Design an enzyme around this catalytic site. Structure first.
Site, PDB file in Angstrom:
ATOM      1  N   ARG A   8      36.597  32.066 -19.467  1.00  0.00           N
ATOM      2  CA  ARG A   8      36.993  32.388 -18.099  1.00  0.00           C
ATOM      3  C   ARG A   8      36.297  33.681 -17.673  1.00  0.00           C
ATOM      4  O   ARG A   8      36.425  34.715 -18.348  1.00  0.00           O
ATOM      5  CB  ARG A   8      38.519  32.519 -18.024  1.00  0.00           C
ATOM      6  CG  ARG A   8      39.168  32.282 -16.668  1.00  0.00           C
ATOM      7  CD  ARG A   8      38.830  30.920 -16.092  1.00  0.00           C
ATOM      8  NE  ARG A   8      39.711  29.841 -16.534  1.00  0.00           N
ATOM      9  CZ  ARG A   8      39.768  28.658 -15.932  1.00  0.00           C
ATOM     10  NH1 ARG A   8      38.989  28.426 -14.879  1.00  0.00           N
ATOM     11  NH2 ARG A   8      40.597  27.714 -16.368  1.00  0.00           N
ATOM     12  N   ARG A   9      35.556  33.622 -16.560  1.00  0.00           N
ATOM     13  CA  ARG A   9      34.754  34.767 -16.138  1.00  0.00           C
ATOM     14  C   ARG A   9      35.600  36.017 -15.957  1.00  0.00           C
ATOM     15  O   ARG A   9      35.194  37.110 -16.373  1.00  0.00           O
ATOM     16  CB  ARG A   9      34.008  34.464 -14.839  1.00  0.00           C
ATOM     17  CG  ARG A   9      32.888  33.475 -15.002  1.00  0.00           C
ATOM     18  CD  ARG A   9      31.573  34.155 -15.313  1.00  0.00           C
ATOM     19  NE  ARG A   9      30.504  33.160 -15.380  1.00  0.00           N
ATOM     20  CZ  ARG A   9      29.750  32.792 -14.344  1.00  0.00           C
ATOM     21  NH1 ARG A   9      29.919  33.348 -13.148  1.00  0.00           N
ATOM     22  NH2 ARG A   9      28.811  31.873 -14.509  1.00  0.00           N
ATOM     23  N   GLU A  38      20.078  26.599 -16.761  1.00  0.00           N
ATOM     24  CA  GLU A  38      18.877  26.857 -15.974  1.00  0.00           C
ATOM     25  C   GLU A  38      18.840  26.005 -14.706  1.00  0.00           C
ATOM     26  O   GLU A  38      19.881  25.787 -14.077  1.00  0.00           O
ATOM     27  CB  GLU A  38      17.641  26.661 -16.851  1.00  0.00           C
ATOM     28  CG  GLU A  38      17.709  27.490 -18.141  1.00  0.00           C
ATOM     29  CD  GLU A  38      16.352  27.726 -18.792  1.00  0.00           C
ATOM     30  OE1 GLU A  38      15.611  26.741 -19.023  1.00  0.00           O
ATOM     31  OE2 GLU A  38      16.028  28.902 -19.078  1.00  0.00           O
ATOM     32  N   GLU A  81      35.157  21.203 -18.979  1.00  0.00           N
ATOM     33  CA  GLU A  81      34.494  21.431 -20.255  1.00  0.00           C
ATOM     34  C   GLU A  81      35.373  21.000 -21.423  1.00  0.00           C
ATOM     35  O   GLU A  81      34.884  20.378 -22.370  1.00  0.00           O
ATOM     36  CB  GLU A  81      34.092  22.909 -20.380  1.00  0.00           C
ATOM     37  CG  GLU A  81      32.916  23.286 -19.448  1.00  0.00           C
ATOM     38  CD  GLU A  81      32.585  24.779 -19.448  1.00  0.00           C
ATOM     39  OE1 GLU A  81      33.410  25.597 -19.922  1.00  0.00           O
ATOM     40  OE2 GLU A  81      31.487  25.134 -18.958  1.00  0.00           O
TER      41      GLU A  81
HETATM   42  C1  LIG Z   1      29.463  27.358 -10.427  1.00  0.00           C
HETATM   43  C2  LIG Z   1      29.114  28.432 -11.437  1.00  0.00           C
HETATM   44  C3  LIG Z   1      29.800  28.114 -12.819  1.00  0.00           C
HETATM   45  C4  LIG Z   1      31.192  28.030 -12.917  1.00  0.00           C
HETATM   46  C5  LIG Z   1      31.786  27.752 -14.173  1.00  0.00           C
HETATM   47  N1  LIG Z   1      31.052  27.575 -15.269  1.00  0.00           N
HETATM   48  C6  LIG Z   1      31.696  27.283 -16.514  1.00  0.00           C
HETATM   49  O1  LIG Z   1      32.983  27.313 -16.416  1.00  0.00           O
HETATM   50  C7  LIG Z   1      33.448  28.539 -17.149  1.00  0.00           C
HETATM   51  C8  LIG Z   1      33.634  29.622 -16.233  1.00  0.00           C
HETATM   52  O2  LIG Z   1      34.688  29.157 -15.352  1.00  0.00           O
HETATM   53  P1  LIG Z   1      35.287  30.195 -14.200  1.00  0.00           P
HETATM   54  O3  LIG Z   1      36.506  29.584 -13.539  1.00  0.00           O
HETATM   55  O4  LIG Z   1      35.566  31.561 -14.822  1.00  0.00           O
HETATM   56  O5  LIG Z   1      34.049  30.390 -13.115  1.00  0.00           O
HETATM   57  P2  LIG Z   1      34.123  30.062 -11.518  1.00  0.00           P
HETATM   58  O6  LIG Z   1      34.378  28.585 -11.292  1.00  0.00           O
HETATM   59  O7  LIG Z   1      35.235  30.865 -10.915  1.00  0.00           O
HETATM   60  O8  LIG Z   1      32.680  30.431 -10.829  1.00  0.00           O
HETATM   61  C9  LIG Z   1      32.059  31.608 -11.221  1.00  0.00           C
HETATM   62  C10 LIG Z   1      31.074  32.070 -10.127  1.00  0.00           C
HETATM   63  O9  LIG Z   1      30.097  31.253  -9.976  1.00  0.00           O
HETATM   64  C11 LIG Z   1      29.769  31.366  -8.507  1.00  0.00           C
HETATM   65  N2  LIG Z   1      29.045  30.305  -8.033  1.00  0.00           N
HETATM   66  C12 LIG Z   1      29.517  29.306  -7.280  1.00  0.00           C
HETATM   67  N3  LIG Z   1      28.499  28.445  -7.009  1.00  0.00           N
HETATM   68  C13 LIG Z   1      27.353  28.919  -7.606  1.00  0.00           C
HETATM   69  C14 LIG Z   1      25.956  28.487  -7.700  1.00  0.00           C
HETATM   70  N4  LIG Z   1      25.496  27.278  -7.054  1.00  0.00           N
HETATM   71  N5  LIG Z   1      25.096  29.220  -8.392  1.00  0.00           N
HETATM   72  C15 LIG Z   1      25.487  30.341  -8.989  1.00  0.00           C
HETATM   73  N6  LIG Z   1      26.757  30.784  -8.922  1.00  0.00           N
HETATM   74  C16 LIG Z   1      27.697  30.079  -8.242  1.00  0.00           C
HETATM   75  C17 LIG Z   1      31.208  31.359  -7.949  1.00  0.00           C
HETATM   76  O10 LIG Z   1      31.194  31.823  -6.473  1.00  0.00           O
HETATM   77  P3  LIG Z   1      32.607  31.862  -5.650  1.00  0.00           P
HETATM   78  O11 LIG Z   1      33.452  30.670  -6.069  1.00  0.00           O
HETATM   79  O12 LIG Z   1      32.335  31.783  -4.157  1.00  0.00           O
HETATM   80  O13 LIG Z   1      33.302  33.172  -5.972  1.00  0.00           O
HETATM   81  C18 LIG Z   1      31.803  32.188  -8.676  1.00  0.00           C
HETATM   82  O14 LIG Z   1      31.574  33.532  -8.132  1.00  0.00           O
HETATM   83  C19 LIG Z   1      32.320  28.830 -18.220  1.00  0.00           C
HETATM   84  O15 LIG Z   1      32.769  28.241 -19.564  1.00  0.00           O
HETATM   85  C20 LIG Z   1      31.274  28.347 -17.708  1.00  0.00           C
HETATM   86  O16 LIG Z   1      30.377  27.622 -18.674  1.00  0.00           O
HETATM   87  C21 LIG Z   1      29.711  27.646 -15.218  1.00  0.00           C
HETATM   88  C22 LIG Z   1      29.055  27.914 -14.001  1.00  0.00           C
HETATM   89  N7  LIG Z   1      27.694  28.511 -11.610  1.00  0.00           N
HETATM   90  C23 LIG Z   1      26.833  27.368 -11.410  1.00  0.00           C
HETATM   91  C24 LIG Z   1      27.117  29.825 -12.050  1.00  0.00           C
HETATM   92  O17 LIG Z   1      27.862  30.753 -12.219  1.00  0.00           O
HETATM   93  N8  LIG Z   1      25.650  29.957 -12.269  1.00  0.00           N
HETATM   94  C25 LIG Z   1      25.078  31.261 -12.694  1.00  0.00           C
HETATM   95  C26 LIG Z   1      24.822  31.271 -14.179  1.00  0.00           C
HETATM   96  F1  LIG Z   1      24.148  32.435 -14.462  1.00  0.00           F
HETATM   97  F2  LIG Z   1      26.007  31.229 -14.838  1.00  0.00           F
HETATM   98  F3  LIG Z   1      24.055  30.199 -14.561  1.00  0.00           F
END
Ligand SMILES: C[C@@H](c1cc[n+]([C@@H]2O[C@H](COP(=O)(O)OP(=O)(O)OC[C@H]3O[C@@H](n4cnc5c(N)ncnc54)[C@H](OP(=O)(O)O)[C@@H]3O)[C@@H](O)[C@H]2O)cc1)N(C)C(=O)NCC(F)(F)F
Ligand SMILES: C[C@@H](c1cc[n+]([C@@H]2O[C@H](COP(=O)(O)OP(=O)(O)OC[C@H]3O[C@@H](n4cnc5c(N)ncnc54)[C@H](OP(=O)(O)O)[C@@H]3O)[C@@H](O)[C@H]2O)cc1)N(C)C(=O)NCC(F)(F)F
Lengths: 139, 140
Positions: A8-9, A38, A81
């Site tokens: 969880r972030r 990526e 996941e």
């Molecule tokens: C969607 C997000 C993601 C979400 C969840 N996980 C898995 O799940 C667990 C974490 O779960 P989680 O609940 O902690 O994380 P969140 O769901 O809360 O999202 C966190 C932040 O990603 C922002 N965000 C939304 N859309 C996009 C987008 N298109 N591109 C880039 N960032 C985006 C979002 O923006 P916001 O909603 O407007 O605030 C929020 O800031 C872990 O096990 C993880 O593998 C993986 C990836 N994602 C692709 C990235 O981060 N990519 C960048 C990276 F460097 F990581 F590659």
């Protein structure tokens, strides 16, 4: 990769990164999103990365499963996941860091089985010993 | 005698402090953190002496990390005591900013207000290798 790290972030970012460093020093290839996710549609890439990894390391920080509760559509990413790891029969290794064990019925039925896996207590005072036990759990 | 003393709050900076320790040791630095290097005896003497002996003072500013220092004019908070020793000894102080909110100087005891005048490094979850390289450049 040998190991997928799910976390969880807002509460597990530092521990998940610490785990990645230690596991890489002991010879394991590790997926964590901020270093290995990526280009492309992340929905597909993340699920394929879980399906490909023999070990599923789950960082149970305080409240880590709270966003899973009542996520009936399965839109929460830790929920997605975990269901993928369970469906593929992965070696699931929960890391306990101040986490409170909830009752199964508060969780969606498709991830309640996560509570039946043996978890490893994270010890701030005995980190080398914690890491050595995690290595024993990995395949 | 260690090159680096790591000052941190257990309840918010434990994991980041441990991560910094691992990275700094991998680059050849000797590091003091309490759970690995504070050994037997009266810890008040041994902690202050370990700050004095390290050239670098790495301060983990997690969210709220200076809150227990506020109005601690008796200097009983341990992060307060470590900072005061670092400042008094002219240490190379390297703050690491992890979601920290910069406070107005007047909320802190006068003997540690100067900690806010040192150049701090922003911790980036997405670019951690680059953060570590910058920390190394700041070390002496
Ligand atoms: C969607 C997000 C993601 C979400 C969840 N996980 C898995 O799940 C667990 C974490 O779960 P989680 O609940 O902690 O994380 P969140 O769901 O809360 O999202 C966190 C932040 O990603 C922002 N965000 C939304 N859309 C996009 C987008 N298109 N591109 C880039 N960032 C985006 C979002 O923006 P916001 O909603 O407007 O605030 C929020 O800031 C872990 O096990 C993880 O593998 C993986 C990836 N994602 C692709 C990235 O981060 N990519 C960048 C990276 F460097 F990581 F590659
Ligand atoms: C006093 C404590 C200490 C405090 C502060 N720092 C420095 O200051 C920053 C952290 O500041 P902090 O605000 O986060 O830490 P706390 O003040 O909260 O205390 C922390 C916990 O040590 C419990 N505790 C109380 N008495 C004793 C005792 N005689 N022996 C062992 N543990 C004790 C206390 O128990 P409690 O108060 O009853 O709950 C509280 O839980 C860092 O930079 C640190 O170098 C260093 C050490 N201490 C000697 C150890 O931990 N020794 C074990 C170790 F492995 F580290 F060597």
């Amino acid at each position: 990769p040998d190991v997928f790290i799910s976390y969880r972030r807002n509460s597990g970012s530092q521990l998940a990164s610490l785990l990645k460093v230690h596991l890489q020093l002991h010879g394991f290839s590790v997926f964590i999103d901020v270093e290995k996710l990526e280009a492309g549609k992340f929905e597909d890439k993340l699920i394929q990365s879980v399906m490909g990894a023999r070990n599923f390391v789950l960082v149970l920080s305080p409240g880590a499963l709270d966003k899973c509760m009542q996520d009936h559509d399965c839109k929460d990413w830790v929920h997605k996941e975990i269901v993928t790891a369970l469906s593929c029969g992965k070696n699931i290794v929960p890391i306990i860091d101040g986490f409170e064990w909830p009752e199964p019925q508060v969780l969606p039925e498709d991830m309640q089985a996560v509570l039946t896996f043996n978890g490893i207590k994270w010890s701030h005072e005995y980190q080398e010993a914690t890491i050595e036990k995690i290595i024993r759990f990995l395949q």
